[PDB]
Structure formats: structure tokens, C-alpha cells
């Protein structure tokens, strides 16, 4: 859901990579500076906290 949500917000000029801790994953998105807001909106809207 998150992956789809980022992809509409931030197009194809993004890198989403994740590694697994012992549950789910802490995930990290890499975005250009000034597409920061597009990425945060996508998480906020999902209900995903930082």
C-alpha cells in the first residue's frame, strides 16, 4: 500500500529499500531534496508514523 502510495506521490525518481528487524520492516525511502513533502504526505495519509 505504502509502496503504491509513494510511487504516485514521488514518481519513479525515488529509491525505496527495506531491511527486516524481527517483525515487519523499518523501511527507508530516499528522495530528492524538495520532494521531501510528497513523501511525508504519503506516509501521513496511510497512517504510517516516522
Amino acid at each position: 500500500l505504502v509502496e503504491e502510495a509513494l510511487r504516485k506521490a514521488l514518481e519513479d525518481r525515488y529509491l525505496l529499500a527495506h531491511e527486516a528487524y524481527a517483525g515487519g520492516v523499518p523501511a527507508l525511502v530516499v528522495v530528492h531534496r524538495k520532494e521531501v513533502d510528497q513523501a511525508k504526505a504519503a506516509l501521513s495519509r496511510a497512517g504510517v508514523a516516522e
Partner: protein, 62 residues
Amino acid sequence: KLEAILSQEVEAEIQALLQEAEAKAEAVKREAEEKAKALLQARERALEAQYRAALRRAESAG
């Protein structure tokens, strides 16, 4: 891709810098030529003064 963005960001700064630094290497080459020029102009002025004065001195004496 995000990487195709980034390569346009270096190639952009690294032309501005090199035009700025050929606008200092031009400016210096000008100001120095106009300097060199004026330091021989001033040399011209001196020689007249010292020859006009001298001829008068040697005339008055004679």
C-alpha cells in the same frame, strides 16, 4: 530513475564555476594590460618633463 536526475546536477554547477573562473582569468588579463600600458604612459610623461627643464637650464647658463 533518481540517478538520471543527479548527473544533471553536477553538470550544471561545474560549468558555472569554470565560466566564473574564466571571467576572473579574463578580467585580470585586461586590468594588467591596462596597468602595464599606464605604467609606460606615465614613463612617457616623465621624460618630457625632465628634457624640457634640462634644455632650459643649459640655455640660461650659456
